[PDB]
């Protein structure tokens, strides 16, 4: 019955419980209205519960993307700002599209940004990409490394296959057991 986090949001609270239940301590999510959520664990498990907050850097800061810093509410805009807000929405759209392939669970894509491509008379340099993936297990993931590498090739102007690197792994082993209350 000892608090360790309070004032959390919704997705910040449903993941801390997924961390603590993986390491065999049982947590409770208590709603508190407009003040956000709060997480309390048992008193014999309070020492271990603080150590797995420091280690995983919990609670999660919200995920930051490039268009959040170049907002559309500005009165004026620059050609540097419109390009970095355009590539920031292609980059979000490609990871929305990798999640609908067979067996993919999550994905993150990165795009190389050109800032002084046309501002000093350079030709624009070639585009590079990189991707991550977390597959459902049982899949021969040595062979599905080429379908991502084919799908991402002709989604831009001119890339090569030696310029795309996708790094993928299988998901962790499932947690289906209740943790267990400390018997006193």
């Amino acid at each position: 019955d000892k608090d360790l986090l309070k004032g959390l949001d919704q997705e910040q609270a449903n993941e801390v419980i997924a961390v603590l239940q993986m390491h065999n301590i049982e947590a409770n999510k208590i709603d508190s209205g407009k003040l956000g959520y709060s997480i309390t664990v048992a008193e014999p498990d309070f020492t271990a519960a603080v150590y797995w907050i420091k280690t995983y850097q919990l609670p999660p800061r919200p995920r930051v993307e490039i268009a959040q810093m170049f907002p559309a509410d500005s009165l004026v805009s620059s050609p540097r700002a419109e390009k970095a807000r355009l590539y920031s929405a292609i980059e979000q759209r490609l990871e929305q599209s990798l999640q609908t392939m067979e067996g993919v669970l999550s994905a993150r894509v990165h795009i190389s940004y050109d800032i002084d491509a046309g501002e000093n008379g350079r030709p624009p340099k070639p585009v590079h990409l990189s991707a991550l993936a977390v597959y459902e297990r049982g899949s021969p993931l040595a062979h599905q490394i080429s379908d991502i590498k084919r799908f991402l090739k002709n989604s831009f102007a001119d890339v090569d296959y030696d310029n795309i690197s996708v790094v993928l792994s299988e998901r962790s082993d499932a947690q289906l057991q209740a943790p267990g209350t400390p018997v006193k």
Partner: protein, 194 residues
């Protein structure tokens, strides 16, 4: 409550096997139905001991056992098309085991699997394992390159390939890895430009 009613509506996708060490096993046929039956045994609505064994995962379990006590053994894959009498495929041209210890190998694979009654070890021709992998690959009209060496063969597929030539590839790899396994011949789909 018997376990075959605690599962889904169809008593068809799951076949329940009585064990030998006083445990009762559940055999699922793919990975998605394994998490269906492991969710039942994890919430705890069954008073006795039970497991969920999978066709893919029961291969990787006793491949660890067989890589410790019997090294240098050339085998292919274990088939569970009927789970009470599994078939242990074994290479012919790469082992010199006599008639007597092949019975000893079967009587110890029976001890790893309490649901089985007997393990039928058969010996198959090793040239035809590399024969069906090549004759099936020329039928799909794919470019390749054979690299024979001692104890294994590999097929290298590189070059700029359109999606007709890598959709037919991945459908032939996954239908060949199910039958023969990836211990004697391994494919190499590397997609680079030129």
């Amino acid at each position: 409550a018997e376990l075959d009613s605690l599962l889904g509506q169809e008593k068809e996708r799951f076949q329940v096997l009585p064990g030998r060490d006083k445990m009762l096993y559940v055999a699922a046929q793919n990975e998605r139905d394994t998490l269906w039956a492991r969710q039942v045994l994890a919430r705890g609505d069954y008073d006795k001991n039970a497991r969920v064994i999978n066709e893919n995962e029961e291969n990787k379990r006793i491949s660890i056992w067989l890589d410790t006590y019997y090294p240098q053994l050339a085998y292919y894959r274990i088939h569970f098309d009927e789970p009470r009498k599994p078939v242990f495929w074994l290479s012919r041209q790469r082992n010199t085991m006599s008639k007597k210890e092949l019975e000893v190998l079967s009587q110890k694979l029976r001890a790893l699997m309490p649901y089985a009654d007997s393990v039928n070890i058969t010996l198959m021709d090793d040239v035809t394992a590399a024969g069906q992998a090549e004759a099936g690959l020329k039928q799909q009209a794919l470019p390749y390159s054979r690299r024979n060496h001692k104890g294994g063969v590999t097929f290298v597929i590189q070059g700029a390939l359109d999606d007709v030539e890598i959709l037919r590839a991945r459908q032939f790899v996954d239908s060949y890895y199910r039958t023969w396994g990836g211990r004697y011949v391994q494919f190499a789909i590397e997609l680079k430009d030129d």
